[PDB]
Design a protein around this ligand. Structure first.
Ligand code: ADP
Ligand code: ADP
Ligand code: ADP
Ligand code: MG
Ligand code: MG
Ligand code: MG
Lengths: 375, 73, 375, 375
């Protein structure tokens, strides 16, 4: 429980549930958003086997489970599994009663309507929270950024999206949503590791490839110069010990894995890339905003924890932007939590406390109340 | 009424200055005084020159970058 | 506030509010007469966003505002917005109490009656000034001209008008009013910049085009010789860096923009032009006045700050006037403020102090008191 | 080829190339102005794959292409791609030699100068036409309207524009150009279909959303009454079968998609709307013209093929116009081709045959010859 009735912030973005109380600088519960179910028979009698394992426990027991992410591309697809994720979030990891704490859910912009409606329905009807508020995730990243002016991208596990904001005013006609993120980079890394000779196809082995992506991948500045550098010798080739076995040795896959985030034609996705959707999100704004966006380009979320993504980002945008502009890629080491941290700052505001969606008016109006009071 | 004007968690002056120390962006003293001119205008005992409901606007004895509180003294 | 109760002069002509105290050589407050209102949602909580921004602050925040001039062609059209302009004029820019200072408002000749009546109503009833006086703007330009004999044009942002005066006596049958001024030249410059390839349609981009007009435009002496000169080569072509972006390069638009002021058929306005309304304003006077008008042709206001407008003016009028006349175009560098400066000189006169319209007689007679005591 | 040397009319406005011979009541070639290029590897050997597919063939093969409109907002942006569009127009669809037929190109008013200059350069230098003529598109809509007096809007795929004409005389100071048209309505429909739950982001899926816009959208008369009507029940909700798959079911998006054309704040464009730019285009004319404009308000082009746009148009303009005026919205079922049809009528005139811009004088003067002889 909690000594106070301080509001909860539950960032459940697409692939890593992180949650805690308001006023904290870091979430108290960080666990992957997986639901593992056993696919083999239980032969030992009276052990204490469960029906489904949730989160970090499913990450431990993954050798005898199948792992299902209940949320994909920022869209919740298994509502009973996501109910297990939230039940594990409040009752097991936080160990708190949700009937006493307001909750601040995060979504992605340009999401389905039934996502936020049914998420509101499960928050009020199943868990009985006193008040809730669903907010756009990159706006919250700009809260923890300490700025009221800037264009933001977060790049979670399922969705990257640019939200440009000038002087506190949202520019919703210029919000870009690109469904290319860390889970797609994990699948592409599974493909190119299959190219080298290491066949990972199991969902547990998919988590192994995710760990390879987190530990060994980095963003190149010039993809052909690093590509010919890896083609020259074994200078950048790095080895990784697999869980419970042998050692693999990966080469150019270190930078071919996140280059898909800049060149989405690698995974076959016709789009402009993360730098060009950032630049197009700047150019779809009004003109006298634009330099303040270039000086406050905020890259403060998830997947963008690669080494050298800020230099590549400033190189590509500075190549796209006109001269005599100051392009500043704000990329703090507070990333991968700053969408949550700005959730804590937004929940800790005094004037925000009228903007909560409570009971009684949800109970007056129904699940469309978010489309009244959320952005 | 006075204590409430400073104590209140949603429009009190300590809550507004706690918010101004918390809220992002350009935080000066001028923006805090303008926030007090926004969220304490329809209060009886708050007194500032640039308040929106001000009957102390033409009060020449109130300098800018200042405000009055109607204490018992 | 002010150490004295010295009278205020508030020249609010059509597009640039400039105001100050009497006895000054220059106005203490110069800001554009705009009211900007936000057209986008406020997504950052507790920032300090306002309902409407006035003047220079609206000029700064113009990327997220819409800009509305409350006064057009010298006629006030939004009285609540103009009340915001005056409230910002006395209380924010000057920081003074209007209950202690007489005010000297300026209008254009041949104006609507409800303009000066309702302006008198807002001065006495809303702001509670002790005395006011509304005066014709070009007469005030002849005060700062240092002459009691001359024909005056000012060319503000909304109206140009000739007032011929001989030996202190107004000639009101010969007052010309032409509704062609700097805002129309801004719109025509938006059209011909659209012709070159630069599309400005936003009100903020309209202010950008106004800055292009102020910085790069000039009046040609022979429009076909400068026209064929620009058609010959790139000699007069000048480049301008846009706010927050790229560099444009404009050519003949430098002199096609103010030539509309001499040839009003460019914007489709059937009239004679500024030189021919000046000459017709001279010829509608009595005959033994006329040479003293030609020797004291005063061009001392707003829009006429173009380079080479005095040479074009003396060329066209000298072409229209008969020979053996001395045509002298009085065009000081004290322009764009001389209508205010003569407001200060008129307010600083000792014998003028009975001509103020005070309380008690406004309170006796009502808002028609200006039509008793103003010209 | 053709039995005669009858002049060609090639209306290539912004998003749908339609062309034919003069004297016809309908264009012989109608195809979308797209250039599709393959983004995947050709794995079948000796099939007959091309480098780029143009028009209707690119509309068929769009599942393995990327689609690029070479002209956007009435401005040609890819001249080599537009050269493919014209080459496909004369040689593939019409199957004719352009060296024997005069051509009548259409542009939008207030266009870039290098558009008509370089379009003239490609017509004479690449295709070697004997004579050409570039004309303003809404003027041509007034030719097929059968009137010499009226204000016209066409609303193509990239630009809507009002041209008021009285007794055959153009009023070019009152021409309105608004860059809000069917491609912007397609993008906004992609956004609000993303709101419902259907994610279309591919350029082929953009063409699917364009087909949804053409088949299911209509203009509401009162947006709040139809909005609350769709909020009341499922009365106006209509379903659409996607290409090669499932059935979607769209509701209020049917009238929120074209309401952006009346309220441009939906796509974030600060403007007055199509009814208020029509009314302002009327009010910027001379006074004794205005009723003849109201009785001959012509709405005879592209995007305005929505159901109920004439009733909404007459409602809004009749609300804006003073009483005792006869407001008549001329909206024939000959729309979407009447800009071409008046191209045929203008090319079929006898006295027009001196107004063609031929060789030899283009060859004397260069590409500025249109700025001599076109409007
Ligand atoms: N160190 C890292 N480097 C690369 N990728 C990472 C790293 N850490 C996280 N990721 C990826 O980012 C995803 C989580 O993103 P996050 O922003 O936490 O999303 P959420 O909105 O669910 O809070 C992870 O699932 C993983 O794919
Ligand atoms: N240096 C300049 N060159 C050309 N035009 C100018 C210049 N400065 C100002 N202007 C035009 O003149 C207008 C200012 O006129 P002004 O006389 O100040 O108007 P008002 O009648 O409101 O005082 C501006 O709107 C601008 O368009
Ligand atoms: N029946 C319809 N309903 C709604 N929109 C339509 C309809 N038919 C065409 N449109 C829109 O109009 C556009 C075609 O306009 P058109 O005038 O042919 O363009 P262009 O100016 O390139 O010739 C299409 O892109 C489509 O979006
Ligand atoms: Mg998250
Ligand atoms: Mg003036
Ligand atoms: Mg066309």
């Amino acid at each position: 429980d909690e000594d106070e009735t301080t509001a909860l912030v539950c960032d459940n973005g697409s692939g890593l549930v992180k949650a805690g109380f308001a006023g904290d600088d870091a979430p108290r519960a960080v666990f992957p958003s997986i639901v593992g179910r056993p696919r083999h028979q239980g032969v030992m009698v009276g052990m204490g086997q469960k029906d489904s394992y949730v989160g970090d426990e499913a990450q431990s027991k993954r050798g005898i489970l199948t792992l299902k992410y209940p949320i994909e591309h920022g869209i919740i697809t298994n509502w009973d599994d996501m109910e297990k994720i939230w039940h594990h979030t409040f009752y097991n990891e936080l160990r708190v009663a949700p009937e006493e704490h307001p909750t601040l859910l995060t979504e992605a912009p340009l999401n389905p309507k039934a996502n936020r409606e049914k998420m509101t329905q499960i928050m009020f009807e199943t868990f009985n929270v006193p008040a809730m508020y669903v907010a756009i995730q990159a706006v919250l990243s700009l809260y923890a950024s300490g700025r009221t002016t800037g264009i933001v991208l977060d790049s979670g596990d399922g969705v990257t999206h640019n939200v440009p904001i000038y002087e506190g005013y949202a520019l919703p006609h210029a919000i870009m949503r690109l469904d290319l993120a860390g889970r797609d980079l994990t699948d592409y890394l599974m493909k190119i590791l299959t190219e080298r000779g290491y066949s990972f196809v199991t969902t547990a082995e998919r988590e192994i490839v995710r760990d390879i992506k987190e530990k060994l991948c980095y963003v190149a500045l010039d993809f052909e110069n690093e590509m010919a550098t890896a083609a020259s010798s074994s200078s950048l080739e790095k080895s990784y010990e697999l869980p419970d076995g042998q050692v693999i040795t990966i080469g150019n896959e270190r930078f071919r894995c996140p280059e898909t985030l800049f060149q989405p034609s690698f995974i076959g996705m016709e789009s402009a890339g993360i730098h060009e959707t950032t630049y197009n999100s700047i150019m779809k704004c009004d003109i006298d905003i634009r330099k303040d966006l270039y000086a406050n380009n905020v890259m403060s979320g998830g997947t963008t924890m690669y080494p050298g993504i800020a230099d590549r980002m400033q190189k590509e945008i500075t190549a796209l932007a006109p001269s005599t502009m100051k392009i500043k890629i704000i990329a703090p080491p507070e990333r991968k939590y700053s969408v949550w941290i700005g959730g804590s700052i937004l929940a800790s505001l005094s004037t925000f406390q009228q903007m909560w969606i409570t009971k009684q008016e949800y109970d007056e109006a129904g699940p469309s109340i978010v489309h009244r009071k959320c952005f | 009424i006075i204590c409430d004007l400073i104590e209140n968690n949603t429009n009190g002056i300590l809550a507004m200055l706690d918010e101004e120390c918390l809220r992002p962006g350009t935080v000066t003293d001028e923006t805090f005084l303008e926030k007090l001119n926004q969220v304490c205008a329809t209060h009886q005992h708050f007194e500032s020159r640039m308040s929106k409901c001000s009957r102390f606007l033409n009060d020449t004895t109130l300098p800018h970058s200042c405000f009055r509180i109607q204490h018992y003294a």
